[PDB]
Amino acid sequence: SVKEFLAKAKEDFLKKWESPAQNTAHLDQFERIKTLGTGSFGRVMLVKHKETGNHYAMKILDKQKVVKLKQIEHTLNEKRILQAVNFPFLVKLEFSFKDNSNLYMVMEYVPGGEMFSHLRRIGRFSEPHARFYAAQIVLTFEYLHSLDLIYRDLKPENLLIDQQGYIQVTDFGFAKRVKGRTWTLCGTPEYLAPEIILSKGYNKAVDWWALGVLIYEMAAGYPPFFADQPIQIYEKIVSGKVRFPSHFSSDLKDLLRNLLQVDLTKRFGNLKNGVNDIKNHKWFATTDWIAIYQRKVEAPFIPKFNFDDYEEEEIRVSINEKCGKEFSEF
Numbered sequence: 001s002v003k004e005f006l007a008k009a010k011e012d013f014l015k016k017w018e019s020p021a022q023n024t025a026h027l028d029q030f031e032r033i034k035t036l037g038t039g040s041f042g043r044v045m046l047v048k049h050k051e052t053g054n055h056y057a058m059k060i061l062d063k064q065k066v067v068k069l070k071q072i073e074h075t076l077n078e079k080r081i082l083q084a085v086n087f088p089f090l091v092k093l094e095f096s097f098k099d100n101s102n103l104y105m106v107m108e109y110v111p112g113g114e115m116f117s118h119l120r121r122i123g124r125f126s127e128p129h130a131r132f133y134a135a136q137i138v139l140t141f142e143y144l145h146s147l148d149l150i151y152r153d154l155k156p157e158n159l160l161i162d163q164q165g166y167i168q169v170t171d172f173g174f175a176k177r178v179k180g181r182t183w184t185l186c187g188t189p190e191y192l193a194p195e196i197i198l199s200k201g202y203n204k205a206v207d208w209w210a211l212g213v214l215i216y217e218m219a220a221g222y223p224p225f226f227a228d229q230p231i232q233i234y235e236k237i238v239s240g241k242v243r244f245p246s247h248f249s250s251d252l253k254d255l256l257r258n259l260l261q262v263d264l265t266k267r268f269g270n271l272k273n274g275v276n277d278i279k280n281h282k283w284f285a286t287t288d289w290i291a292i293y294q295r296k297v298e299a300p301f302i303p304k305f306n307f308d309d310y311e312e313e314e315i316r317v318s319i320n321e322k323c324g325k326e327f328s329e330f
């Protein structure tokens with residue numbers, strides 16, 4: 001049944017992967033409300049789609065700046081991945097379009113903010129609460145890896161909490177469709193697997209290491225490897241020593257020791273049994289996997305009807321088309 005679901009999901013993905021979506025919608029169809037985040041070559045705004053009244057998060061990217069920072073192909077690959085994937089815990093890309101100045105990606109609005117912010121506000125989660133969130137990541141990585149996608153950007157900041165208290169994964173900035181090995185040093189230091197830091201190639205197993213870090217951080221209220229200098233963080237990561245808080249259950253420690261396995265060939269999620277070594281672990285014994293997928297489990301936290309404040313700026317669109325041919329495939 002899981003095998004049957006994933007086989008169908010692979011077919012669905014490849015159809016969209018090989019034949020991308022047509023350009024939909026225009027700027028004036030959305031009322032601009034508030035800036036939700038800013039970056040070097042773009043910003044994300046809370047918008048209301050006028051005709052439906054639906055609220056969305058619109059990513060506005062400055063074309064000239066994308067071209068300047070050599071981010072053309074990165075932008076296109078990221079869009080291509082977003083429009084092709086379909087899973088409950090991945091943010092829906094609703095519309096994409098472009099004008100003379102900007103590229104626009106209109107995504108599902110996730111109102112409850114980042115898990116980072118939730119951790120900053122409430123501290124460590126109980127093991128049952130950590131397990132609720134962990135279960136959604138497991139199923140998400142199961143789905144993504146079945147499509148040969150490595151995520152390689154798991155961190156609390158990239159996990160947004162929806163009105164039902166469920167995770168919506170944003171930021172496909174480092175996501176890569178790869179069969180076999182790759183080498184790029186990308187991602188936040190705290191969450192990097194030893195094989196990313198070291199000169200050797202890596203595969204999808206890096207996502208499972210990152211899951212180990214996330215579960216540790218949720219249950220402890222701090223990351224397993226931290227220091228002021230990234231090099232010092234790396235030294236701790238490669239060394240293979242983790243200190244577990246005294247309140248960590250035996251089941252939690254065993255799962256974490258197997259996820260935070262320095263030898264990628266011995267790491268849970270990367271053995272012959274695959275995801276089942278994680279899903280069937282004693283720590284996940286109480287987890288109803290179907291119920292999590294269907295979002296039928298009551299969440300630990302429902303956001304109040306969450307984001308940090310940013311200064312507002314109007315969308316300026318030039319009367320002359322910028323970088324037209326460069327973004328033809330967008």
Ligand SMILES: c1nc(N2CCNCC2)c2cc[nH]c2n1
Binds near residue numbers: 001002139290
């Ligand atoms: C267990 N069950 C799953 N379902 C929910 C019930 N209908 C079939 C698909 C999925 C989907 C991804 N991973 C899963 N693990």
